[PDB]
């Protein structure tokens, strides 16, 4: 009933469909300054406090630039977000899983460095992952291999075998793009959703009439996907149950019965 991780005002649909109440800054993380991952783009609230840490991976030949929406939209709702670049454009999901792990390790280190823009902004104990395509698989692999992680949002996950995810205990929200021809939802995203233990808080939202890149910068679903992603991270990274209506109740139903959505699965309520 006391939630120490609680931040921002009581959520409204309209507030969650746009940049949040937290002023943010971004800096880049040079490839040369890190091993474990290929650098990337760091977004953080300027307000004093410690926030959940979120690492986001692009997919095959993907760059951090294509997911800056996720950096800005999540950070502005009260998170520290690192959208990574990979060691190589050709890294497979198991590799993207290690890099997400290492990027989260990096944020924890920088959190103790008085020179860092994120000095004392990172709650080391509250970590989440997300990613596009092979980055989505990577995010679910990292969540499997780091069960202390609070949340995973695989977005249009590629074809890591759904078998690999039968022991995921980390609350997982999967985005699908209905007319994805690169990672068809019916053979890729949906079997992964179904492979996750039913005791694991989970959710699948499928964007109607859109392709593999419907979740990326300019995909055309900033309002709805952002609102779902913010709500998933708030719910599980911040244990903020004010966000339940947006993933399980009235405001989720609004979204998931809307023309924008072609499929919806979940083990609600939570
Ligand atoms: C998991 O839940 C699904 C969806 O309701 C159900 O089909 C399946 O039997 C459940 N799995 C187990 C192991 O009970
Ligand atoms: Ca689109």
Residue numbers in the entry: 23 to 292
Describing publication, verbatim:
Substituting His/Phe with Ser/Ile should expand the substrate-binding pocket to accommodate the bulkier substrate PET, and the strategy termed “double mutation (DM)” has proven to be useful to enhance PET hydrolytic activity of several IsPETase-like enzymes. In contrast to the protein expressed in Escherichia coli, CtPL-DM expressed in P. pastoris is inactive in PET degradation. Structural analysis indicates that a putative N-glycosylation site N181 could restrain the conformational change of a substrate-binding Trp and hamper the enzyme action.
The catalytic triad was found in an open cleft formed on the protein surface. The TPA-binding W180 adopts the C-type conformation in the CtPL-DM structure and an alternative type in CtPL-DM-S155A. This suggests that DM strategy has conferred the TPA-binding Trp in CtPL-DM a wobble conformation. In both structures, a sugar that is covalently linked to N220 was observed. N181 and N261 face towards the bulk solvent and could be glycosylated, despite no additional electron density map attached to these residues was observed. Notably, N181 is located adjacent to the TPA-binding residue W180, and its glycosylation, if any, could likely impose spatial hindrance to prevent W180 from wobbling and impact the substrate binding. Nonetheless, W180 in F235L-S155A, which carries N181A mutation, shall be able to wobble freely. On the other hand, the conformational change of W180 in CtPL-DM and CtPL-DM-S155A is restrained by the glycosylated N181, thus impedes the binding of PET.
